[PDB]
Amino acid sequence: YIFHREKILELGSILKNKRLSLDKRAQAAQKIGLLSFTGGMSAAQFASEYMTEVAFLLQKKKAMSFRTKILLLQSVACWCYLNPDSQRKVRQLEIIPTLIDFLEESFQSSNKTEINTHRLCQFWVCYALTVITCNNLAIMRELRSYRSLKFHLQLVATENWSGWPENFAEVLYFLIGFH
Amino acid sequence: MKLTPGCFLWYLYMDKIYCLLSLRNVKALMVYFHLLDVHHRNTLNDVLFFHFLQHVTNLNKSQIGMIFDLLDWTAVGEIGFDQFYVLICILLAHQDHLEDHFMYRHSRPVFELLDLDGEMNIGAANFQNYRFLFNIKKQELRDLFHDFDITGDRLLNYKEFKLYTIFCTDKSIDRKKRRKDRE
Amino acid sequence: IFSLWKPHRTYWTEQQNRLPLPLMELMETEVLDILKKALITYRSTIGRNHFMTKELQGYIEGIRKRRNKRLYFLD
């Protein structure tokens, strides 16, 4: 029990050291995500304090490289599932509008320098947002609120899915209700 | 015993009430057991787990020696589920320093693993080299031999190990007991 | 009730499956390391003159295409 709690306590004390490169803290945040998911419920209300720092740094997406943003994509994807206090915590505290804000990435901003990593970013953000869906009623109303994303959802219907377990875009469009 | 940090076995969850693992974690481990069988015969071979413990631990080939013939209780060479699950249970129960609580209620299994040859009685030549698993030094081997041999013929018993496993969880009053012992 | 009900119930039917974690498709790097250690001990054992050699060769390209689908363009 408490050994997991104390070890994530000191590596969280690394996580609030500001004067360091971010990538070791990003794989540290991967360790919070995996250890909190393999703990259970009690690890999730233990780790209920620790989204302050990652929620602070997720608005600085225009500075760091693509590795950091895809790393907190699978950090929040590993953290989010089977977690009720999480899934009503995130839509009141700027997460799924921030994933919408993440999505403009490159369809109006950039065209190509090495733009394969861009569709890798779309792969990991859609796999992030399918596993936050659960069975509530709140979140797909504001997903219905936006306008152009359905058209972009058409674009993620167009692209081929290589070696994935199943095509998450078509079950996304099935769950989003614009059919 | 010091395992390598950052490994998968360092990410498991240990409970401090019955000293066990979860249903979803052993679901994950039967998925890795299913994918790790190269000839897919619902069983396990040796050198893969040998390299696995070389990655996750730091122990030389003698430890491979007595580990790989303690786990070969099936006496056919090819191993399976239960020995793998109980061995990963014990090796992730070493570092938590509450393994005395683990064989507080796992008496009959460590009987059956220490009964390497099926006569229900255990000699000193069996566990003289298993002291790496339980960090017991030779002076308290001498003390446990000359203080807890009701059998008296360098041999063990079921109720003797019941006294041994209620002895294992309360060592502070055991040092105050040996403080009282000469008086 | 109504078109709220009949869709989303099936999505909790989606919520039981094997459900790999996002790191379960990338935790096998040391599993590749220990099996490639088994390959180099196997090359010290018998070499290429053999056919269960060929089936573990089929296993190493099978996991090569199994890891390639996440590592074509990621590199």
Residue numbers in the entry:
A (entry chain B): 58 to 236
B (entry chain A): 1 to 183
C (entry chain C): 119 to 193
Pull text from the paper.
The cation channel of sperm (CatSper), primarily localized in the principal piece of sperm flagellar tail, serves as a pivotal sperm-specific, pH-dependent, and low voltage-dependent calcium channel. Calcium signal transduction mediated by CatSper is essential for sperm hyperactivated motility and successful fertilization. CatSper is the most complicated ion channel known, comprising at least thirteen components.
Notably, further improvement of map quality in the region corresponding to cytosolic map 2 by local classification and refinement yielded a local map at 4.8 Å resolution, which displayed clear secondary structural features, primarily α helices. During data processing and model building, we noticed a distinct additional density near the previously characterized EFCAB9 and CATSPERζ, which may represent an extra component of CatSper. We found that the main body of the predicted structure of ARMH2, which contains three armadillo repeats, can be perfectly fitted into the density. Moreover, we also tried complex prediction of the candidate proteins with EFCAB9 and CATSPERζ using AlphaFold 333, and the interface predicted template modeling (ipTM) score of ARMH2 stands out among all other candidates, which is the only one above 0.7. The predicted ARMH2-EFCAB9-CATSPERζ ternary subcomplex is highly consistent with the cryo-EM map. The cryo-EM resolved regions of the ARMH2-EFCAB9-CATSPERζ subcomplex are primarily in areas with high predicted local distance difference test (pLDDT) scores, supporting the assertion that the unassigned density belongs to ARMH2. Notably, the residues that potentially mediate specific interactions between ARMH2 and the other two components are highly conserved across mammalian species, suggesting a conserved interaction mode of the subcomplex. Based on the structural characterization, we speculate that ARMH2 acts as a scaffold to support and reinforce the cytosolic subcomplex.
